[PDB]
Amino acid sequence: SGAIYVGNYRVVNRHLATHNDWANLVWEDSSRDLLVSSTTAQGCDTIARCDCQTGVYYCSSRRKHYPVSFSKPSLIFVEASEYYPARYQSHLMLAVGHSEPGDCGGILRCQHGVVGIVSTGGNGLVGFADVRDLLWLDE
Ligand SMILES: NC(=O)[C@H]1CCCN(C(=O)Cc2cccnc2N)C1
Ligand SMILES: [Zn+2]
Numbered sequence: 001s002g003a004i005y006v007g008n009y010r011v012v013n014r015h016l017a018t019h020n021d022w023a024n025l026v027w028e029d030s031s032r033d034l035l036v037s038s039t040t041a042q043g044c045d046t047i048a049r050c051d052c053q054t055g056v057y058y059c060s061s062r063r064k065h066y067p068v069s070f071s072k073p074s075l076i077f078v079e080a081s082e083y084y085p086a087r088y089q090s091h092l093m094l095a096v097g098h099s100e101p102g103d104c105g106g107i108l109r110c111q112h113g114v115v116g117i118v119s120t121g122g123n124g125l126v127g128f129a130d131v132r133d134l135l136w137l138d139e
Contacts, residue, residue, distance in 0.1 A: 001060070002105025004114055005043030006137050011036050013104045013119055013129070015083035031090045033119045033129050036137070047137050048112035055110035057118060057126065061100040068095035070108070073130040078120055091130045092119065099126035 004011040012021060014028055014035040021037040028035040053072065056065050070093040080086040093108075099121025106118040108128045120127030131137065 001102070002058070002107060002117060004045050004047075004107065004117065004131065005039065006045045006047055006114075007043055008039050009036050009043065009137055010039050011117070011131060011137070013117060015081075016104060030084070031087070032092075033084075033089060034131070036134075046113035047134070048110050048115050048132055049135075050110065050112045050132065052110035052112065052115065055108050055115055057095075057097065057108040057128065058106040059098055059118075059126075060103050060106055062098060066097050068097050068108070068126070070095040070128060073133070076120075076127070078127075089120065089127075089129075091133070093128045093130055094120075095126050095128070096124060097126040098124070 014033050017035040024037040026036045054069050056067050058065050073091040075088045075090045076092045078089045103118045108115045116128040116130045119129040
């Protein structure tokens with residue numbers, strides 16, 4: 001679990017969005033595993049606007065943060081799960097690191113701010129849904 005709180009927006013993994021997230025829907029994209037909902041309170045976070053390929057993510061299944069090198073956002077095949085059929089997930093960045101289901105929502109940050117959230121994993125890999133291209137989050 002986990003979310004990004006920026007301005008009057010909450011960014012979560014689409015597959016973990018609550019009834020309240022869907023009742024206050026701003027934008028969602030199944031191909032990216034992202035959903036953004038509106039909030040009444042002003043959020044705690046800054047979004048990175050950069051091309052960093054290194055940063056640090058929070059791994060809830062270890063209660064720890066780990067440094068990672070990650071690929072540029074791209075279209076990557078993701079196996080079928082209970083939440084989606086087998087498909088290509090876009091804007092996804094992979095890195096070598098620990099992740100379990102439950103780790104989705106952990107933030108990846110670089111020195112400029114929030115880069116994205118954990119969205120996929122397994123086999124010693126961790127995948128992050130990129131948010132740096134969503135310029136409207138702080139416009
Ligand atoms: N389609 C998606 O974005 C995900 C939906 C939930 C299930 N998916 C995983 O990759 C979970 C996972 C498996 C094993 C270790 N770590 C993990 N985070 C795919
Ligand atoms: Zn950066």
